[PDB]
Design a binder for this molecule. Structure first.
Ligand SMILES: *[C@@H]1O[C@H](CO)[C@@H](O)[C@H](O)[C@H]1NC(C)=O
Ligand SMILES: *[C@@H]1O[C@H](CO)[C@@H](O)[C@H](O)[C@H]1NC(C)=O
Lengths: 13, 182, 178
């Protein structure tokens, strides 16, 4: 029913 | 001006339904993959030196890794269950037709609008299969959940003979055939 | 292996443009219109079978943008190398005089994901009834894109799919006629 997305990792600056 | 591209591909690979699932999270910078998470491993791995600092930093975050290790279930299997009915189980039978192509005209078997892509097209001459006298465009994807292919019989048609194009596809339980009476 | 679902997303500078889409075995399930911040299903019926909250995609893109700025600096601002596309024009089915059909312009194996595509019928730019896909993924990480032009076959018409890409020195025109 609900498509779930994968989240990108946040690269450290 | 110069361009800079950042790409992320989150892939879910399925083997025998959801029996075996593999999750791959891949990062690319200007076409170069630099780091990735592979569910078979359970942690990030640098693909190039550019990703070493990234993998090292992320791998020190157990909370992040625990989240990613749960994706084969919470993301891959979940989504598969949501879309399988209209994707994995999608079946659209092909439209089959035969037409002559240009003092002789070779027969062309057009097989279009089908899904999925797996298909087998065979030519027969009066009941005997022309196993080696055929050339094709190969599988053509139309970008809209349908495919097509043209399969041409190289044998010159002879008046009196009957040529049959046979198509096998997941959408039908017996071959679809179109006969051309020369 | 039997099936693969890929969530593909990207952000491009200096264009400041990004895309987000889901791919199933080579076909698109849906993508997110970044400007309208809406979910666009590839086939209309899909929308009654599933649901996707577009906002999630926007937040992802914001992160990809941040990652890009960082990775650009770490790689010494080395620009992406242009890879020109190969273009093919075909119909979705055998052509017949009074039976409507669809011309397909397939743009393949290129990067960056930026192109100008124009349909020309007897030299006239056609913007009526046309449609196109977003930039689709390839295993080699280049892109694919499809443009469509429904038409009525005629021995009097000629068509051209004109494609522009920074990897090309001049516009690439692929001709087609009944
Ligand atoms: C995986 O496939 C095998 C053989 O096709 C089958 O025996 C098994 O039940 C499948 N696993 C499931 C339940 O998805
Ligand atoms: C598309 O056309 C515009 C207008 O001329 C041009 O500035 C831009 O560079 C073109 N894009 C490509 C990739 O050719």
């Amino acid at each position: 029913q609900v498509i779930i997305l994968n989240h990108p990792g946040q690269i450290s600056a | 001006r110069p361009r800079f591209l950042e790409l992320l591909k989150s892939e879910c690979h399925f083997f025998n339904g959801t029996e075996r699932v593999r999750f791959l999270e891949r990062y690319f910078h200007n076409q170069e993959e630099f780091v990735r998470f592979d569910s078979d491993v359970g942690e990030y791995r640098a693909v190039t030196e550019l990703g070493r600092p990234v993998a090292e930093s992320w791998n020190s975050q157990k909370d992040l890794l625990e989240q990613k290790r749960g994706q084969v279930d919470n993301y891959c299997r979940h989504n598969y269950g949501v879309v399988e009915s209209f994707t994995v189980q999608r079946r659209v039978h092909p439209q089959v037709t035969v037409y002559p192509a240009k003092h002789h005209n070779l027969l062309v078997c057009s097989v279009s609008g089908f899904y999925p892509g797996s298909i087998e097209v065979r030519w027969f001459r009066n009941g005997q299969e022309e196993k080696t006298g055929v050339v094709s465009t190969g599988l053509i994807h139309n970008g809209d959940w349908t495919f097509q292919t043209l399969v041409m019989l190289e044998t010159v048609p002879r008046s009196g003979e009957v040529y049959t194009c046979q198509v096998e596809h997941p959408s039908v339980t017996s071959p679809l055939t179109v006969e051309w009476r020369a | 292996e039997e099936h693969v679902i890929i969530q593909a997303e990207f952000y491009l500078n200096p264009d400041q443009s990004g895309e987000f889409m889901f791919d199933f075995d080579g076909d698109e399930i849906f993508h997110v219109d970044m400007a309208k911040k809406e979910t666009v299903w590839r086939l209309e019926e899909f929308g009654r079978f599933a649901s996707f909250e577009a906002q999630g995609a926007l937040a992802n893109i914001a992160v990809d943008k941040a990652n890009l700025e960082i990775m650009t600096k770490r790689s010494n601002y080395t620009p992406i190398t242009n890879v020109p596309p190969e273009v093919t024009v075909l119909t979705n089915s055998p052509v017949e005089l009074r039976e409507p059909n669809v011309l397909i312009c397939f743009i393949d194996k290129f990067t960056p994901p930026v192109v100008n595509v124009t349909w020309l019928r007897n030299g006239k730019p056609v913007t009526t009834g046309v449609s196109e896909t977003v930039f689709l993924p390839r295993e080699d990480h280049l892109f694919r894109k499809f443009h469509y032009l429904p038409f009525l076959p005629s021995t009097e018409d000629v068509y051209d799919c004109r494609v522009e890409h920074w990897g090309l020195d001049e516009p690439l025109l692929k001709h087609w006629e009944f």
